[PDB]
Amino acid sequence: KAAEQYQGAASAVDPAHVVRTNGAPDMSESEFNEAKQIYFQRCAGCHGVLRKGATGKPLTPDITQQRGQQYLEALITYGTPLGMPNWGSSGELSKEQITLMAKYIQHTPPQPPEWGMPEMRESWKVLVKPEDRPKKQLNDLDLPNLFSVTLRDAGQIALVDGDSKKIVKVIDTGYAVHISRMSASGRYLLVIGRDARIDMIDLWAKEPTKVAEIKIGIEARSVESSKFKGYEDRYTIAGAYWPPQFAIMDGETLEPKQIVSTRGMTVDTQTYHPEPRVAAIIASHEHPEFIVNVKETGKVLLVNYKDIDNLTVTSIGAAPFLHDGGWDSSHRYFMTAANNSNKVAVIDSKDRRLSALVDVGKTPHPGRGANFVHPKYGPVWSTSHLGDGSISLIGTDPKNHPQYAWKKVAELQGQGGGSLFIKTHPKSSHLYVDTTFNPDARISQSVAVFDLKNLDAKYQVLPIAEWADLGEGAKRVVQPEYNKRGDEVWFSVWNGKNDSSALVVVDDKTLKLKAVVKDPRLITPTGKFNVYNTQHDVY
Amino acid sequence: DMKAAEQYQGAASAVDPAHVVRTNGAPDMSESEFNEAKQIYFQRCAGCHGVLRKGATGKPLTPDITQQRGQQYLEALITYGTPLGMPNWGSSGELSKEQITLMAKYIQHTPPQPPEWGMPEMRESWKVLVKPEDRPKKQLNDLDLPNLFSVTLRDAGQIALVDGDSKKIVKVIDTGYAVHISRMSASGRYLLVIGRDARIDMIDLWAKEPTKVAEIKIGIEARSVESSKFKGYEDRYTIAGAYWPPQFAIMDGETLEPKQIVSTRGMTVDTQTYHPEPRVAAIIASHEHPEFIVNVKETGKVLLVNYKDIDNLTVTSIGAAPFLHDGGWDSSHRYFMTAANNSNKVAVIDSKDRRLSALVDVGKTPHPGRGANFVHPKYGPVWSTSHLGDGSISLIGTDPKNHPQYAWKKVAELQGQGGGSLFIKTHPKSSHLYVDTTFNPDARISQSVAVFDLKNLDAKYQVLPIAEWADLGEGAKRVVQPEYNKRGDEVWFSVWNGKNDSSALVVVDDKTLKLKAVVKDPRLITPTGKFNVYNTQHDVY
Numbered sequence A: 001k002a003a004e005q006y007q008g009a010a011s012a013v014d015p016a017h018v019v020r021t022n023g024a025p026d027m028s029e030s031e032f033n034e035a036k037q038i039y040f041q042r043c044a045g046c047h048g049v050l051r052k053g054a055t056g057k058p059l060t061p062d063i064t065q066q067r068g069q070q071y072l073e074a075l076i077t078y079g080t081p082l083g084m085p086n087w088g089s090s091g092e093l094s095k096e097q098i099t100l101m102a103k104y105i106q107h108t109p110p111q112p113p114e115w116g117m118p119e120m121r122e123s124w125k126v127l128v129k130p131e132d133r134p135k136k137q138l139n140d141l142d143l144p145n146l147f148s149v150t151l152r153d154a155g156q157i158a159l160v161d162g163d164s165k166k167i168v169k170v171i172d173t174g175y176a177v178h179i180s181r182m183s184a185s186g187r188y189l190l191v192i193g194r195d196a197r198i199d200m201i202d203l204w205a206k207e208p209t210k211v212a213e214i215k216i217g218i219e220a221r222s223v224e225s226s227k228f229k230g231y232e233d234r235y236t237i238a239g240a241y242w243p244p245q246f247a248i249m250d251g252e253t254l255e256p257k258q259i260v261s262t263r264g265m266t267v268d269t270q271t272y273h274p275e276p277r278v279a280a281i282i283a284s285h286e287h288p289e290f291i292v293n294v295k296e297t298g299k300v301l302l303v304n305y306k307d308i309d310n311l312t313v314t315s316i317g318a319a320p321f322l323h324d325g326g327w328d329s330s331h332r333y334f335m336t337a338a339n340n341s342n343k344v345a346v347i348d349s350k351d352r353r354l355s356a357l358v359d360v361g362k363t364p365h366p367g368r369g370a371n372f373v374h375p376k377y378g379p380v381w382s383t384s385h386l387g388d389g390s391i392s393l394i395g396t397d398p399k400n401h402p403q404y405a406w407k408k409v410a411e412l413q414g415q416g417g418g419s420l421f422i423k424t425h426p427k428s429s430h431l432y433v434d435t436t437f438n439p440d441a442r443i444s445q446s447v448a449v450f451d452l453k454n455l456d457a458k459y460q461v462l463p464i465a466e467w468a469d470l471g472e473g474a475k476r477v478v479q480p481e482y483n484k485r486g487d488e489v490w491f492s493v494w495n496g497k498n499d500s501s502a503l504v505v506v507d508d509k510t511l512k513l514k515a516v517v518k519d520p521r522l523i524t525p526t527g528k529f530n531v532y533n534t535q536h537d538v539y
Numbered sequence B: 001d002m003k004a005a006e007q008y009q010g011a012a013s014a015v016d017p018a019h020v021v022r023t024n025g026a027p028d029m030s031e032s033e034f035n036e037a038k039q040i041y042f043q044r045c046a047g048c049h050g051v052l053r054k055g056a057t058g059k060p061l062t063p064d065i066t067q068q069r070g071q072q073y074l075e076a077l078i079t080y081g082t083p084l085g086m087p088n089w090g091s092s093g094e095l096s097k098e099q100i101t102l103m104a105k106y107i108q109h110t111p112p113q114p115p116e117w118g119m120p121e122m123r124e125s126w127k128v129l130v131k132p133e134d135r136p137k138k139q140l141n142d143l144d145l146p147n148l149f150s151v152t153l154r155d156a157g158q159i160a161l162v163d164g165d166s167k168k169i170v171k172v173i174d175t176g177y178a179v180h181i182s183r184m185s186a187s188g189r190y191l192l193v194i195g196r197d198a199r200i201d202m203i204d205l206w207a208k209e210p211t212k213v214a215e216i217k218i219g220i221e222a223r224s225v226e227s228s229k230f231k232g233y234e235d236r237y238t239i240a241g242a243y244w245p246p247q248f249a250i251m252d253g254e255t256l257e258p259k260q261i262v263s264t265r266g267m268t269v270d271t272q273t274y275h276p277e278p279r280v281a282a283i284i285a286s287h288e289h290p291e292f293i294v295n296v297k298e299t300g301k302v303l304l305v306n307y308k309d310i311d312n313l314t315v316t317s318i319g320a321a322p323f324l325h326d327g328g329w330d331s332s333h334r335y336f337m338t339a340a341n342n343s344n345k346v347a348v349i350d351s352k353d354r355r356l357s358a359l360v361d362v363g364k365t366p367h368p369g370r371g372a373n374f375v376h377p378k379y380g381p382v383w384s385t386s387h388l389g390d391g392s393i394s395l396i397g398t399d400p401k402n403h404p405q406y407a408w409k410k411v412a413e414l415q416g417q418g419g420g421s422l423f424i425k426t427h428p429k430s431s432h433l434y435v436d437t438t439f440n441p442d443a444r445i446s447q448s449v450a451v452f453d454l455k456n457l458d459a460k461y462q463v464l465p466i467a468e469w470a471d472l473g474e475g476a477k478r479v480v481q482p483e484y485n486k487r488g489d490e491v492w493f494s495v496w497n498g499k500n501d502s503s504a505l506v507v508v509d510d511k512t513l514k515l516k517a518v519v520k521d522p523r524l525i526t527p528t529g530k531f532n533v534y535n536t537q538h539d540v541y
């Protein structure tokens, strides 16, 4: 009773300022569920799970009830020119569905599940114990020249032999694998699905097999392994969209060790954000750290793993909407893109600070980027864009080229907007640029190639999809990727699930068609990751 | 712009729609009925159950659990309570049967949402009353600043500066509502006070008359404020912790300018699950590194917030035990001895090696305040704490160097008057150990304090009738917090009576245990915490 009188006083919170959420249009269970289904299928990507807004404006009841039924129906129908699709004019949704959507967004956002240690441990499985795994490579595959290709809609990945151009193994994974990363030893392949399911594959077994699996959230995109000297196969980190968090695991077994929330304050307005999605993650070579990108808040986190029991995190402020990125030629500066801010942030992994914020074109999408030595400007890092056809060249040498350090030194022009990946190699004199999401079929079905020994000359259009000889379907071409020795570039002809797809290989020295990989199992090929080039960050 | 970026994010979310739940199936209640219940909730239930009803000292009152219990179960539990900390709202006749029904219906609805409080709101509340350049260069008064006391006048929303030697009120200043604590800056010039409403006030003790130079509001609800104490950082930064929103804020220690706000929402130490309301508790400034040691309650984390580079903040998260509350330094100012009250443990944080040294098992609901340090004739240097759940006083060894066999062990135990204790106190020059019993259900015990002889710890305590000595008449007259003067010969107590009744500050001669003086004033409304300037600034306890 002592402890009851002790916590007996009134809260300092004014009850009048604590608000009841309602005044929404009545809808039955059948009507609400149909609407909720359309929301996660068509709208959550841009508006967020909690509707607080990401690429899209906030769709919370305070804002939507203010607009009213008619406004909302009209906006969902015609869309806007600033990136909001027309759901009615395009005939994607019916008048009835749009009315249900307008009604839905006026209600309190339904609550999604959380995912902590109990759920993570429950999903954790060690298929082959470390003690019972091989001691050496029991197969005769050229592992450094292997490719980890994502078979998207099939929820699988295929290991394609670089030299023979054949599928060696097809493995069951999580749904729609986003990326593939290698461990610092070059033995373990790590893949993560968008469903946040991670699979660890031992390339040393007679036939490459899965040794462990875990689910780190409801939705995720990135996975990474420790790369600092003395920490080979020590830790594995993964970043989640829902819940806004990241997880550090044991690099041998995938045992969940630490989970850290990314819910916090923004860099720009310094206000609370309930859904800061984790984007790109890159392992530092300078300090025993993981460089984690937190999107909506525009924060770059340096997560130290020297002591994972008492975690040290340095929160570097950058720019809103941090997405993808990669290392400069020297592997010290993390060049990441803050896409909706139309900027590229430079993170010094050595001095542990923001070196600069470089203004580029509309919606920069570098992937990991493309590094080469410019004849006039010295070492540069490049990126193409989704919002326009420009290619930005940024100086990456503060030591021997201060005049050009962190400056958008020059621009190149591609086929158009909708570009996703730019690529080059140390042993190559070519620069490749795709145009995957470009509204024109011909442009999206081809890639642009520049001559690094003559950047004044226009690019050469390579008819990648046409060379594949596939027939019907959108046949969008995505991601240029080189092999171990850098003499051939691979492309994915991403066609629909019920259609035929292929991987097209081009001879880098001659710009001619070298090979075409077709297989009935090659369903919806997206990302391709060459083992050597991924492990040693060769871009 | 356009169509390319629309297909790029055109794919479906990996989230299963079927798993995202719609909340309702709650009893229909009108606006007047909902607001009447919501009023009672924040007045009587929020402290223990939390603002979002996810549970703190109290169990979760989220729709999933309450709708499962049903209307009748809820009405019965709110009426009779339980023996595990849940009050009997109906049996005691505190709430009417009609109010209890409204409450039962209320907790079955989705918890209403409070506002957030970020930088726009903080800057809007930020005021510089006297600019640094316009402030004095020397002390413009004849006040004995080191021996001044900063007494909280709770319900009045004010503080009072009482001269240690004369026993008179020098100045009454308008502050935030119900000031929780007073802290001094490292220079000894500025007095920092924070209200439970999260309003901070910075007072210059060097002006003609001690006046306010700056103010700011760091949240909707708060408890702690602190200043940077590492060498080379005098008056550099001021930090404050909030209950709602779950956050802390770092400000300029000269102007109170908001620089950084950090969310404490995160994963727990025990279950490693997400918690949407981790309240900030005690904050203490490190002398070993340029850091602030912040306690995060519900998650049970002790954060080492480095302020060397305030633009790129570095935080080290140390796991301790759930329900971290109050604490203080050991005799050497190296080990932060903090209580995880509902876990019945005292955590030891090494501020030098930056790690958890131990988790000592103590009694029921430890409440140390800042604690009491003295050298035990047998066990060596110790740190003590009294309890709310029982009458025991735990003595914990704090010397790993010369007494490793006793380090981080509940070495011995002393017995007080009973439960409901809040503060234990001693001083270097003193051979006495004082312990209050503020919240003890018996009137006579709560109106008195216990005193132990440090020279002969085997002997039983002496009872000092503090409230009786005050001669105040009617009222609860609960006695709270023993605090010494700079010399260590006087021990002050607060006779915390009701706002409409008469209160007093009782001073005792430590050398003789006899009544020295009584401070009465019509402005001395609901006195609670008293902080001696020198003793607060230099952590003398």
Ligand code: DHE
Pocket (backbone or CB within 6 Å): A045, A152, A176, A177, A178, A179, A221, A222, A223, A278, A279, A280, A281, A282, A323, A324, A325, A367, A368, A478, A479, A526, A527, A528, B008, B009, B010, B011, B012
């Ligand atoms: C955060 C993130 C990364 C960086 C991780 C890293 O490197 O650590 C990444 C990388 C990638 C990479 C890495 C390439 C590389 O060379 O590094 C690939 C192949 C890729 C294929 C696609 N991505 Fe990706 N991608 C997202 C997020 C991300 N993608 C999205 O949220 C988005 C906008 C919407 C979505 O529906 O997922 C999106 C669209 C796409 C696609 O449409 C692609 C072509 C097919 C798909 O499955 O969704 N993303």
Ligand code: DHE
Pocket (backbone or CB within 6 Å): A006, A007, A008, A009, A010, B047, B154, B178, B179, B180, B181, B196, B223, B224, B225, B280, B281, B282, B283, B284, B325, B326, B327, B369, B370, B480, B481, B528, B529, B530
């Ligand atoms: C977090 C916290 C601290 C440590 C801060 C620090 O040192 O940095 C503290 C310290 C304190 C101290 C510090 C004394 C010291 O010497 O260190 C005092 C005087 C004090 C007066 C009270 N506290 Fe306190 N107090 C709370 C929280 C805290 N109190 C509560 O949440 C609680 C349980 C409920 C509430 O109503 O706020 C509570 C009850 C009380 C009281 O009932 C007191 C007596 C009167 C009041 O105004 O609420 N608390």
Ligand code: HEC
Pocket (backbone or CB within 6 Å): A038, A039, A042, A043, A044, A045, A046, A047, A055, A056, A057, A058, A059, A063, A064, A067, A072, A075, A076, A080, A081, A082, A083, A084, A085, A087, A101, A105, B005, B006, B007, B009, B010
């Ligand atoms: C991204 C590729 C989008 C998808 C998928 C959907 N929306 Fe969206 N929406 C998006 C943007 C970038 C904007 C901003 C518009 C602007 O011109 O600034 C919006 C806006 C809306 C709004 C209006 C908010 C307001 O102004 O009050 C609504 C009502 C809206 N969007 C609804 C919505 C629904 C229900 C969708 C799925 C069926 C949907 N959007 C998809 C971007 C994108």
Ligand code: HEC
Pocket (backbone or CB within 6 Å): A003, A004, A005, A007, A008, B040, B041, B044, B045, B046, B047, B048, B049, B057, B058, B059, B060, B061, B065, B066, B069, B074, B077, B078, B082, B083, B084, B085, B086, B087, B089, B103, B107
């Ligand atoms: C702390 C000093 C309390 C105050 C003030 C209130 N409650 Fe509480 N409550 C508290 C505890 C420690 C517990 C646990 C009881 C146990 O024996 O374990 C509870 C529990 C409840 C519950 C039951 C939850 C369940 O098991 O389903 C209810 C319905 C409840 N409390 C409601 C409630 C209301 C409405 C109050 C204010 C008018 C209130 N509590 C205050 C501690 C404390």
Ligand SMILES: [C-]#N
Pocket (backbone or CB within 6 Å): A324
């Ligand atoms: C992915 N972009």
Ligand SMILES: [C-]#N
Pocket (backbone or CB within 6 Å): B326
């Ligand atoms: C305060 N206790």
